[PDB]
Amino acid sequence: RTTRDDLINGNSASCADVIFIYARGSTETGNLGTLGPSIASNLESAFGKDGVWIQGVGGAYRATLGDNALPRGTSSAAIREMLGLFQQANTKCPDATLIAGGYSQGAALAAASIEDLDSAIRDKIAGTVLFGYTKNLQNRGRIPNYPADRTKVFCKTGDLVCTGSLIVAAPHLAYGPDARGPAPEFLIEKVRAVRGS
Structure with missing residues (x-):
């Protein structure tokens, strides 16, 4: 449900073909929050439970609201934690x-x-999805050093964080439908583009 540690718990002798690493929003629970489970379920349907490992970013990532104001939009400790997960996967x-x-x-x-x-390692990430991307304006809708074709940004009209602000308005909490459909659709398409099927 809200907590998945498939990568950490996973047996190296039986590696999944696809590994998904996901970071929740501020104040959200477990390591998947409100949107992660919906994405997870759909990935499992496409690749099978044994075909994909779902790994949320927990540990040092406390998802503290105040950290949105830090230079990179989160804490140094949190970045260290997520980098470590990509390294573990690799x-x-x-x-x-x-x-x-x-x-x-x-x-x-x-x-x-x-x-x-x-x-x-970065080059191994076939696709990345971002919802309510807090650095959307600052980064011009891109992830530095990462191709635009492998990136999909979901930023709703009226979601002020996508427009250079840190104010939380109602549209920021409306990504449910996206997480249930287009987000996993994009991810599945990007994986199959490189792995075939």
Whole structure:
């Protein structure tokens, strides 16, 4: 449900073909929050329970509201935690295709991590989805050092965080439908583009 640690718990001798690393929004529960489970269910339908590992970013990532105001839109501790998960994935399962996503503060965290990532690992992330991307304006809708074709940003009209602000308005909480359909659709398409099927 709201907590998934498939990568950490996963057996290296039986690596999934796809590994999804996801960062929740501020004040959300578990390590998946409100949107992660919906994405997870759909990925499982496409690749099978044994075909995909769902890993939320927990540990040092406390998803503290105040951290949105920090330089990168999240804490240094949180970036360290997500970088460590990508590193663990790369080590435990070198042939797995990676995919990532984040919501709100988690979207900033995802962008910051991917930006700092070793290029050899970053290049393994076939697609990334960002909802209510807090650095959308600042980054011009991109993730630094990461291709636009592998990025999909969901930013609703009226969601002030997508427009350079840190104010939380109603549209910021309306990504449910996106997480249930277009987000996983994008991720599945990007994985199949490289892995075939």
